[PDB]
């Protein structure tokens, strides 16, 4: 069923024809207790 669903149609074939170890604290601020995290 997965293979039937995800078979490539012809048009897609025709069209066809940075890592670094960061930390969560470095990018995103911590959230105060009792508050919904938002990002």
């Amino acid at each position: 069923e997965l293979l039937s669903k995800k078979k490539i149609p012809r048009k897609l074939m025709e069209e066809i024809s940075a890592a670094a170890k960061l930390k969560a604290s470095r990018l995103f601020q911590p959230v105060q207790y009792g508050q919904k995290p938002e990002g």
Binding site: E1, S4, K7, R10, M13
Partner: peptide
């Protein structure tokens, strides 16, 4: 002639995925 190659590829792939 790439069109014929794509047609052949598509036909074979559709035949291969068709059967459970």
């Amino acid at each position: 002639l790439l069109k014929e190659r794509l047609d052949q590829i598509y036909l074979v792939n559709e035949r291969r995925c068709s059967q459970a």
